[PDB]
Design an enzyme around this catalytic site. Structure first.
Site, PDB file in Angstrom:
ATOM      1  N   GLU A 104       6.911  -2.176  -6.264  1.00 12.26           N
ATOM      2  CA  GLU A 104       6.348  -2.091  -4.917  1.00 12.26           C
ATOM      3  C   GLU A 104       5.545  -0.804  -4.744  1.00 12.26           C
ATOM      4  O   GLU A 104       5.670  -0.101  -3.741  1.00 12.26           O
ATOM      5  CB  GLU A 104       7.443  -2.193  -3.855  1.00 12.26           C
ATOM      6  CG  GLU A 104       8.259  -3.475  -3.921  1.00 12.26           C
ATOM      7  CD  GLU A 104       7.438  -4.710  -3.605  1.00 12.26           C
ATOM      8  OE1 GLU A 104       6.283  -4.560  -3.150  1.00 12.26           O
ATOM      9  OE2 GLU A 104       7.946  -5.832  -3.811  1.00 12.26           O
ATOM     10  N   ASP A 105       4.720  -0.486  -5.739  1.00 14.76           N
ATOM     11  CA  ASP A 105       3.865   0.695  -5.772  1.00 14.76           C
ATOM     12  C   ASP A 105       4.660   1.990  -5.882  1.00 14.76           C
ATOM     13  O   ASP A 105       4.057   3.071  -5.875  1.00 14.76           O
ATOM     14  CB  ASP A 105       2.953   0.783  -4.539  1.00 14.76           C
ATOM     15  CG  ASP A 105       1.816   1.772  -4.723  1.00 14.76           C
ATOM     16  OD1 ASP A 105       0.788   1.392  -5.319  1.00 14.76           O
ATOM     17  OD2 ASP A 105       1.954   2.930  -4.279  1.00 14.76           O
ATOM     18  N   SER A 106       5.985   1.928  -5.986  1.00 13.89           N
ATOM     19  CA  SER A 106       6.771   3.138  -6.148  1.00 13.89           C
ATOM     20  C   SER A 106       6.410   3.822  -7.466  1.00 13.89           C
ATOM     21  O   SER A 106       5.680   3.283  -8.300  1.00 13.89           O
ATOM     22  CB  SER A 106       8.264   2.816  -6.097  1.00 13.89           C
ATOM     23  OG  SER A 106       9.044   3.975  -6.333  1.00 13.89           O
TER      24      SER A 106
END
Ligand SMILES: [Mg+2]
Ligand SMILES: [Zn+2]
Ligand SMILES: [Zn+2]
Ligand SMILES: [Zn+2]
Lengths: 114, 65, 43, 49, 56, 49, 262
Positions: F3-5
């Site tokens: 999640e784009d982390s």
RNA sequence: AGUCGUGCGUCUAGGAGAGGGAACCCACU
């Protein structure tokens, strides 16, 4: 504000055993050894040494969470072979290999002038 | 402010050669890459650590305090 | 107990006293660091 | 064939925050807008004093 | 709280960090993307509430 | 990093990566509420307070 | 016989060698212990008595912590948490003093050599700042202007890089094996030709190039690991690898002792 | 090629806590 104690990763806590051995009911002659304050470094090497032994049947290491410096090694051997004996033999073999490697490296370094 | 003591990526000590880097850039009029190679920086992590640094410490020292 | 922003000279003034520097007309009147022992760690 | 005038450089159409974006054209416009909005919140040296 | 599944009961797991951690899948019902999303945790204060949260 | 982390190196973090200094300033005044009455900057001693 | 080492080249702080007849897990564990488990000496505590530089006390303390320190006799030194001492006794810590101040129109540059050892080392070559630059100044610490007085004390304790990267004795530990894709461990990403897109590795010359005629060797296992160890300066690369091996052996022995006791 | 002008300073060791509304602006999911 509540970061984990960095020193606690490699230091045993109060009233905490380095190794916790318990039986495993999933398969016969299977044991679970929980190593505290240890990382992949020792677990992977011990498991690789165990798998190199014909008598050892199953040897798998698992890290539950990166936060906690702890892992669990499941070891299952043949009937009549105590898993603790197999682990001791693997550790002895690892020590012997490390000593041989140290001696070879020292000899090579001494031989080379630089 | 000052050049980082050690490279963030690998940890190689790069603070010693910052003055040497400036001297090579000025005294010898060498290009950035040649000077960095002469200083002994192979991995591009240290190369960008030295090249991208900005000397704000001198600007802060420009003030009287 | 106090220092001047420009002169950077100690004043050691007390209560019910002017807060202006004696050497100059500036009255920033910064205060020197505490004498209590201070410790820091690289972590 | 007339071109009475011409642009000094097209990249100058970008603003202060947009110009910071490397290769804005290679990126989608909503991403460029998000980057421009976020650049104001970046932590860094704002003044030497 | 766009839809019904935006508020669900979870079992607490104490961790030594200042950020809530949840399973990857539950992000979809929450429409979370871990790009700064801030979520709320409400602790029940009675056995009735705990049972209702666990069962409903 | 889903999640784009992102995953950041702890060694780099403790070695000087993205460390920041936060400065917060508090201002105080002795604004006078009534002539001849003003606040005083003194350490309270619990007496008459 | 066991595993043997073939040192392709050696230097003051960089050694490239080859390990043979060794498992991949063993090599990886050796690298991990060498990068993390090797004890080292570095500044841990910083006490400020008079600081007026433009920098901050925490900033300068962090910079000082990363300063390499001699750790050849680190084994003789004992952890502070172990020995029964009140605080930073000479038997478990190294004490240095940093003093400096500017003058009329010449900025004062603070280097590692400025640090002066104050504790009694009992004839141990431990804690001395590491100097490697040709000029010999050392690691730049900060700059002081006229009227800026820097005066502090530094206490360095024995520790490992796991607790903090400042104790890292090795900067980069390059580890490679199977230059030619013999074990099919990696599927090279190609658009026109895999060989052309990916340049041949330097170690490729030390192994016979694969022959398309023969089939894939499914019995082959990782071997002939090329390892290049670079030392920051606190410990020479040879001593770095020796201490890594010693630490790994000690950990295995501790595991065995725990098993026997339990 | 065999000798020479110039400088320095005089007294120092005794138990405990509790609180601002409105409006405007910036910004995050
Ligand atoms: Mg989001
Ligand atoms: Zn680097
Ligand atoms: Zn003044
Ligand atoms: Zn001690």
């Amino acid at each position: 504000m509540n970061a984990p104690d960095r020193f606690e990763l490699f230091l045993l806590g109060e009233g905490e055993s380095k190794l916790k051995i318990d039986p495993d009911t999933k398969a016969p002659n299977a044991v679970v050894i929980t190593f505290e304050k240890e990382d992949h470094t020792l677990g992977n090497l011990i498991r690789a040494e165990l798998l190199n032994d014909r008598k050892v049947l199953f040897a798998a290491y698992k890290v539950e969470h990166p936060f906690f410096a702890r892992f669990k090694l499941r070891i299952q051997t043949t009937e009549g072979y105590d898993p603790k004996d197999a682990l001791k033999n693997a550790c002895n073999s690892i020590i012997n290999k490390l000593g041989a490697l140290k001696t070879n490296f020292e000899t090579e370094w001494n031989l080379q002038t630089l | 402010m000052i050049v980082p003591v050690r490279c963030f990526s690998c940890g190689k000590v790069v603070g010693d050669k910052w003055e040497s880097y400036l001297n090579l850039l000025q005294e010898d009029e060498l290009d950035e890459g040649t000077a960095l190679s002469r200083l002994g920086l192979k991995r591009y992590c240290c190369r960008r650590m030295i090249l991208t640094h900005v000397d704000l410490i001198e600007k802060f020292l420009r003030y009287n305090p | 107990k106090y220092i001047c922003a420009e002169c950077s000279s100690k004043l050691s003034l007390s209560r019910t006293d002017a807060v202006r520097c004696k050497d100059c007309g500036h009255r920033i009147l910064l205060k020197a660091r505490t004498k209590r022992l201070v410790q820091f760690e690289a972590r | 064939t007339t071109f009475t005038h011409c642009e000094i450089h097209p990249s100058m159409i970008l603003g202060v925050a947009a110009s910071i974006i490397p290769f804005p054209d290679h990126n989608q416009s909503p991403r460029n807008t998000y980057q421009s909005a976020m650049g104001k919140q970046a932590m860094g040296v704002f003044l030497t004093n | 709280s766009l839809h019904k599944m935006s508020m669900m009961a979870h079992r607490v797991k104490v961790i030594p960090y200042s950020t809530f951690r949840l399973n990857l899948s539950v992000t979809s019902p929450y429409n979370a993307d871990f790009d700064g999303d801030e979520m709320n945790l409400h602790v029940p204060q009675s056995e009735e509430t705990r049972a209702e949260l666990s069962q409903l | 990093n889903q999640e784009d982390s992102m995953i950041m190196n702890q060694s780099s973090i403790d070695r000087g990566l993205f460390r920041s200094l936060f400065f917060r300033s508090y201002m105080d005044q002795e604004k006078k509420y009534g002539m001849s009455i003003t606040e005083t900057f003194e350490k309270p001693q619990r007496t008459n307070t | 016989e066991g595993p043997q080492v073939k040192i392709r080249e050696a230097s003051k702080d960089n050694v490239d060698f080859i390990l043979s007849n060794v498992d991949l897990a063993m090599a990886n564990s050796l690298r991990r212990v060498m990068i993390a488990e090797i004890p080292t000496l570095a500044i841990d505590s910083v006490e400020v008595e008079t600081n007026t530089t433009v920098l901050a006390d925490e900033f300068i303390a962090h910079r000082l912590g990363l300063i390499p320190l001699q750790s050849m006799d680190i084994e003789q030194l004992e952890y502070s948490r172990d020995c029964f001492c009140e605080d930073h006794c000479d038997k478990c810590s190294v004490v240095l003093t940093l003093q400096a101040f500017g003058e009329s129109e010449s900025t004062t540059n603070v280097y590692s050599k400025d640090l002066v050892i104050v504790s009694n080392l009992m004839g141990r070559n431990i804690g001395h700042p590491i100097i490697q630059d040709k000029e010999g100044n050392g690691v730049l610490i900060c700059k002081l202007r006229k009227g800026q007085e820097l005066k502090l004390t530094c206490v360095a304790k024995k520790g490992i890089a796991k607790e903090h990267a400042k104790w890292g004795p090795a900067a980069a530990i390059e580890f490679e094996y199977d230059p030619w894709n013999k074990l099919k461990h990696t599927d090279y990403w190609y658009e026109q030709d895999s060989a052309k897109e990916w340049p041949q590795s330097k170690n490729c010359e030390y192994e016979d190039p694969p022959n398309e005629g023969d089939p894939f060797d499914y019995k082959a296992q990782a071997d002939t690991f090329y390892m290049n160890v670079e030392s920051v300066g606190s410990i020479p690369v040879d001593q770095v690898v020796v201490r890594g091996i010693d630490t790994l052996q000690k950990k295995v022995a501790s595991i065995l002792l725990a098993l026997t006791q339990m």
